Design a protein around this ligand. Structure first.
Ligand SMILES: *C[C@@H](*)[C@H]1/C(=C/c2[nH]c(/C=C3N=C(/C=C4\NC(=O)C(CC)=C4C)C(C)=C\3CCC(=O)O)c(CCC(=O)O)c2C)NC(=O)[C@@H]1C
Ligand SMILES: *C[C@@H](*)[C@H]1/C(=C/c2[nH]c(/C=C3N=C(/C=C4\NC(=O)C(CC)=C4C)C(C)=C\3CCC(=O)O)c(CCC(=O)O)c2C)NC(=O)[C@@H]1C
Ligand SMILES: *[C@H](C)[C@H]1/C(=C/c2[nH]c(/C=C3N=C(/C=C4\NC(=O)C(CC)=C4C)C(C)=C\3CCC(=O)O)c(CCC(=O)O)c2C)NC(=O)[C@@H]1C
Ligand SMILES: *[C@H](C)[C@H]1/C(=C/c2[nH]c(/C=C3N=C(/C=C4\NC(=O)C(CC)=C4C)C(C)=C\3CCC(=O)O)c(CCC(=O)O)c2C)NC(=O)[C@@H]1C
Ligand SMILES: *[C@H](C)[C@H]1/C(=C/c2[nH]c(/C=C3N=C(/C=C4\NC(=O)C(CC)=C4C)C(C)=C\3CCC(=O)O)c(CCC(=O)O)c2C)NC(=O)[C@@H]1C
Ligand SMILES: *[C@H](C)[C@H]1/C(=C/c2[nH]c(/C=C3N=C(/C=C4\NC(=O)C(CC)=C4C)C(C)=C\3CCC(=O)O)c(CCC(=O)O)c2C)NC(=O)[C@@H]1C
Ligand SMILES: *[C@H](C)[C@H]1/C(=C/c2[nH]c(/C=C3N=C(/C=C4\NC(=O)C(CC)=C4C)C(C)=C\3CCC(=O)O)c(CCC(=O)O)c2C)NC(=O)[C@@H]1C
Lengths: 161, 160, 68, 48, 161, 160, 161, 160, 161, 160, 160
């Protein structure tokens, strides 16, 4: 994987160049928002279960998905769906901390679409759940890191769909 | 970098980041401008560091520029200086990154086998890196000189 | 963090394995504290007996230093 | 026929999920006769 | 697709064996029940629209499905859903006539789950509608063809869910 | 703590301390005095924080103090506030250590099984820790309050 | 492992009272000794190979052990001994940075005598090499870290002998 | 809307927008306040229009509200008035959008199939829509009456 | 696709609600800025080729991209890159006129990331070119519609990256 | 079921069905008639059993139907009764199958995670299942009551 | 407001405003921006504050929403929450004016008689107001929290 800093380092290493002024502005631009990312990550880690519960209540349950014949019918499937939501939330937090979606590409999106197609999981409903989680996280973290958190949720949704 | 290390360990244990890891991230982001200034100074003085590093290495080990030497010849010494510039660039990368993953993935893993392939003295390369350490610390204040010295000593220890 | 230093023998009584069945039938090996229970349960399940167990690595107080 | 230019007529669901599908589905699956508390808080707030 | 007769013929052809007493027993076993299947199919074709109307009344309409926010909302989606009901009824009739769900596997259930997931259609509601249609068809045809009709509706429901 | 974490990380790789790892230790030793001040402040205000946390918890969750609640009577409520005191002490230990190793080894691993055996509401305990954090935030400076709130939020997340 | 802070934490945890003024003084002292500790560790890490070289030249090579009929004889055995020397240096640096010899006992000193007797490795020569590393570090590092470096260096020798 | 069709056909021919389409956009944006006023007026007059259209429809075609009638009984007339409300809402949407695209997507495609399935008279629903048109046009000025009558007559023509 | 007006209409249609004060406020907010969008679209259409020329000269050419080994090397690849730049500019103009990025989601970004990954096109270089075009367009259109045009260029760049 | 648990067990050794397993399969097929009759008797009285069990549960644990209760409100109470009906259905499935294999996969695995996410009292749900057991055993003869209650006690133990 | 009270005393004594009154007017107008910010914040959180205040009030004493309770039923609970909304509006008015004359003239003088006539529990209403104070102070900084808490305690004392 790679964060913003390591991404800049590889981008200059491939050309065999020392760090120049523009690379300096990129690194400084990441460094300027270091504290806000850490604070929002701590907030998300402290409120992990509540975010998932509110997102599920808003977007998944009270639906066909929880009724017999639905995809998240039965306790096993309900637990699997909430586990997938927790997976998405944790990796969104990692991507937000690192300032780069490379971890999302490597550890989440690769083959998840085909696995969901084979299993019959509703990708549209999953992306709706991710969007509800994005709304709740943006509410919790505040304007400071709301957009920066929201970009990686949008990245996950676009990659899944 | 520190972010990559913390995130990788947290993902490997399948958990959110610990408060200690968050504190190390906070310290790393705090030291960012200082690290950038040190790297800017080194990249500005990249050529002089390389030249006197080569002079110190040749004074210490004239056998390498001897007939049975790996770098015998002007183009062989040019290749030695080019490897020197490569390692200086890697040191600047490590200094800005705050840790040694980029330096590791670029210039130490397999370096033993590569320099065995080229029949080059690894201790001689380490001595050249030490000469670079001296020349670079000669251009920096004490704290920043020590900070660069940590990465230079890491390179020397890795080439071992 | 600590490894128990134990010795034991485990006989296989269902398959009669037929090549160098001696190093896997009587051994001493350091096993971690976190994996010691699952390691020791296997001997009882197979039917062998544990001859001795030793703390070796860690102190009896535990508290801090237990994690690893 | 003989005047109309050929045009795209059908899509596979994989292709259709690429054009739409970004940001998922906002509709929420509804059920006939399901028990749902959605909208009750908003209705109570308007009544108040 | 394939039916009882062609199924027996192909099953003996792929092993290269001639029509034996066993395949003969399966063949007259299909032949004995020919008239009942034809009568049930004629009754279903005659009462096609009323079956869909009653199934929709029992299972779909007069609910949140036909309200705003429901998938059945709007004339476009209402017409599409009743078209889907007609699809299921017609293919169940073909499967009952042929005595084999191979046509259901080849031309109904293949890709249907993923298509419905992509479109956002409620699969649980669709299975409920199929069950209501099965109940009405079993009422109309009578015990003579009730079980034979019901097995293919059950096959469709099990494939979808 | 930070020192034990860095040392274990180096020992696992069988290599010496990386420059970023040394920078982490230097930053922690430089920032230790503020943590010591936090610890002494929380220690001398330990009883008021516990009392206010108990009041907030009993207001938020009346069910715990009820006829069928886990803490009904006097000795039950005494034990609940005692557990709050243990968690306050663990928070002070974590603050002085700079990481969460002692807190993890003392009071979170197995706490789920223990509280399930005792049939105590784990969300109720989390609410109590949150009330403790709210009380502690009113007796420290803003940076110092954030530093303590990091470990308080760690405990809240760990009891989840 | 248990560093100084963790050791004080355990000392108060087994007795069950809060941190006291004595604990504050001990932690403050260890915080005061931090910077010189890091500098000495950095110097030792820089000059790790040189220390082993002088220690070997002073107590190990050119002697009977570096000739036929010796435990140091053969390149494999000499490499094993030098790797053990590097182990001693690295764990001594770890214990020096930690403040407590718990790492020295559990990770290094634990065992290391029954194995040596079984292998046939001389122990007096190993202790002499450890002391040789002691004078080498005594010159390499400043006098501020000399005493604390020497005490952890003597700990390994005392445990082995 | 008009913007939608202009952009759609420009994209389909793979070109920037023509000045004629820009003139359409300019006129559409200029008329926006008047369209909003008309939509507002129908919005507050939605219930009177529905009630009077229901009365006119039941007078013109009494057979629909009769024992074999599709809308016989209080609930079946409630559903009929609800459908009339739906079509008035669609007409207001079309007036705001500037053309009958929303009316088509929401209440014309498949209306024949749905009402044939429900066994409801299409001419009766068309007569109800015409009565709604008359009642709505009695509450508007002449130009606004013509503007709303265009969409109402489109609905009547499409239901055919 | 959908513009602001159709977006509001659909948002109220899904709830089955007549247009209220908030929806009227949103529609008025769009209608107030109608003429500025048309003027900016006319300016961009008139200056289309010049914008691409300056953006290429500022971000792409005179580098390793146009040399051997570069992705935009050879006349076919150069023409391809400029055609892609033209497509991005045209769809940015369409999105700015419609006041909604739905057309960007439907007709440009769908599978573009995966297509570029398959072809080997540098997404970072493409984003740099898009931002150069954004700077030139902001220079041309002026303060009136500069931010309005710029938000959709930022949308395209974030969707690609 | 018993057949699945017996056949797959004699398939993990690559042997035919055991002569010890050409038994209790036998008792299962012998008692299948009684099992079907008991399941039918429970199925006929599903509504009365659910209603009385919910009544007893709401008396014994009235906190759930209070304002601070998970099941506060008419539809949250309807959901609780629906869950009780679900568990009665699973119990009938277990009775007909002769093993708790189907009920285990359908409504036990992950039930702790589901109810913790929804914030529902698992002890309250277990007590509801106990009340359902009492109401069910009130409608059956002694042997059949014991047979049904044995599965009911399995549900009570598993939800724990 | 303070202007009104100063002018009333000045006109009662038949004299121009004293320098002390002018200074308090000056400070009163100086504090206006922070007061307006507090009132704006409370106005934006109207719905949440009211809903959470109702939930806490019903948790603390559920007897008012019981069958024999004053606020039993949906249409009765709506009136209680509307009364809480009334008092929140009065508190915002008081904050903007700077003191409690609007609160007195609109919502406390005669409140005992009105609530005695309606037979509603004034102690219950006071606790409902206090819950609103808690929810409001949860959304404000410390100084603004104390400033709003002054008016909330005034209302609580007045309803007594
Ligand atoms: C909100 C929940 C939605 C849902 C999900 C669902 N998922 C499964 C099963 C699996 N989910 C995964 C997921 C991942 N593998 C990965 O590598 C990652 C990222 C690192 C993820 C997120 C996998 C591998 C499986 C298969 C294994 C398994 O069955 O556990 C299921 C169960 C399906 C089944 O019963 O066969 C569900 C229900 N379902 C919904 O309806 C929600 C939208
Ligand atoms: C006696 C009732 C107890 C209670 C229950 C309660 N449940 C819910 C919500 C849900 N319950 C389920 C259950 C299941 N899904 C399955 O597949 C199975 C296995 C057959 C079960 C048991 C689900 C999925 C939901 C979610 C909603 C839905 O069904 O769509 C609720 C509502 C909680 C909320 O916050 O809305 C309640 C109250 N509560 C009690 O107090 C009783 C002990
Ligand atoms: C045979 C002449 C006698 C006898 C023997 C007997 N042995 C076992 C079990 C084991 N035998 C071995 C042997 C070896 N392991 C090795 O590694 C080697 C050399 C490479 C040897 C020879 C071991 C370790 C076992 C135990 C594990 C196993 O069973 O494989 C048994 C079985 C004891 C039991 O039932 O547990 C027996 C009977 N028995 C006689 O009567 C003879 C005198
Ligand atoms: C000679 C062609 C090269 C060379 C060699 C050189 N060697 C030493 C010192 C030692 N060499 C050994 C060697 C071995 N020990 C073993 O067990 C084996 C395997 C049989 C070998 C080959 C040892 C142990 C020593 C140390 C002294 C001792 O034996 O006690 C030196 C001296 C180094 C010094 O610092 O004094 C040298 C110079 N030098 C060259 O230039 C040639 C390439
Ligand atoms: C060195 C100063 C002296 C010496 C040493 C010597 N050691 C071995 C072999 C081993 N040494 C170890 C040591 C360790 N294992 C651990 O895990 C640790 C702590 C983390 C230690 C210290 C062990 C287990 C071995 C055996 C496996 C191996 O060889 O790596 C040898 C080789 C013996 C042989 O040939 O079998 C030697 C020579 N010899 C001297 O003469 C020095 C005085
Ligand atoms: C009223 C003037 C006429 C009339 C109507 C009538 N309609 C129904 C039932 C339904 N009507 C609809 C309509 C729509 N769904 C949509 O999405 C739209 C587009 C906005 C429309 C117009 C639907 C879905 C139904 C089904 C029931 C439901 O809404 O859930 C009935 C009832 C028929 C029955 O069999 O119950 C009636 C009577 N009848 C007349 O006589 C008038 C001419
Ligand atoms: C130009 C700034 C950059 C660049 C681009 C580049 N693209 C291609 C080839 C293709 N580009 C597309 C693009 C699209 N298809 C769509 O539907 C849309 C939106 C509506 C887009 C933008 C496609 C499909 C292709 C493949 C088919 C084709 O070649 O026409 C190339 C050519 C690669 C090749 O030679 O195979 C290039 C060079 N290259 C750069 O260096 C810039 C960063």
């Amino acid at each position: 994987m790679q964060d913003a800093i390591t991404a800049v380092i590889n981008n200059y290493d491939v050309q065999g160049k020392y760090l120049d002024g523009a690379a300096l502005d990129k690194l400084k631009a990441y460094f300027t928002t270091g504290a806000v990312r850490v604070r929002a990550a701590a907030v998300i880690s402290s409120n992990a279960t509540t975010i998932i519960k509110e997102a599920a209540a808003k977007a998944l349950i009270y639906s066909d998905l929880t009724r017999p014949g639905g995809n998240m019918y039965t306790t096993r499937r309900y637990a699997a769906c909430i586990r997938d939501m927790d997976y998405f939330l944790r990796y969104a937090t990692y991507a937000m901390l690192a300032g780069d979606p490379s971890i999302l590409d490597e550890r989440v999106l690769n083959g998840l679409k085909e696995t969901y197609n084979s299993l019959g999981v509703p990708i549209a409903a999953t992306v709706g759940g991710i969007q509800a989680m994005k709304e709740v996280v943006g509410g919790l973290v505040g304007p400071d890191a709301a957009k920066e958190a929201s970009i990686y949720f949008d990245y996950l949704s676009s990659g899944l769909s | 970098s520190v972010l990559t290390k913390a995130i990788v360990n947290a993902d490997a244990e399948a958990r959110y980041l610990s408060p200690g890891e968050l504190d190390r991230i906070k310290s790393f982001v705090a030291s960012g401008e200082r690290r950038l200034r040190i790297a800017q100074t080194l990249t500005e003085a990249r050529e002089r560091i390389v030249k006197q590093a080569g002079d110190q290495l040749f004074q210490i080990r004239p056998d390498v520029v001897s007939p049975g030497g790996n770098a015998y010849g002007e183009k062989m010494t040019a290749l030695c200086l080019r490897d020197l510039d490569y390692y200086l660039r890697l040191v600047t990368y490590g200094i800005v990154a705050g840790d040694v993953t980029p330096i590791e993935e670029i210039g130490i893993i397999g370096v033993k086998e590569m320099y065995n392939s080229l029949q080059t003295p690894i201790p001689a390369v380490a001595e050249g890196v030490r000469a670079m350490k001296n020349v670079a610390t000669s251009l920096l204040s004490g704290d920043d000189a020590a900070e660069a010295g940590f990465y230079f000593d890491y390179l020397v220890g890795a080439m071992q | 963090s600590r490894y128990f230093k134990v010795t034991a023998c485990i006989p296989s009584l269902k398959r009669v394995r037929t090549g160098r069945e001696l190093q896997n039938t009587f051994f001493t090996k350091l096993v971690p504290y976190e994996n010691w229970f699952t390691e020791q349960q296997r001997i009882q399940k197979a039917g062998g007996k544990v001859l001795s167990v030793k703390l070796f690595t860690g102190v009896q107080g535990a508290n801090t230093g237990v994690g690893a | 026929g003989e005047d109309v230019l050929p045009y795209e007529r059908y899509l596979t669901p994989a292709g259709l999920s690429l054009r739409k599908g970004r940001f998922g589905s906002s509709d929420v699956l509804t059920t006939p006769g399901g028990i749902t508390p959605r909208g009750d808080a908003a209705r109570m707030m308007d009544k108040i």
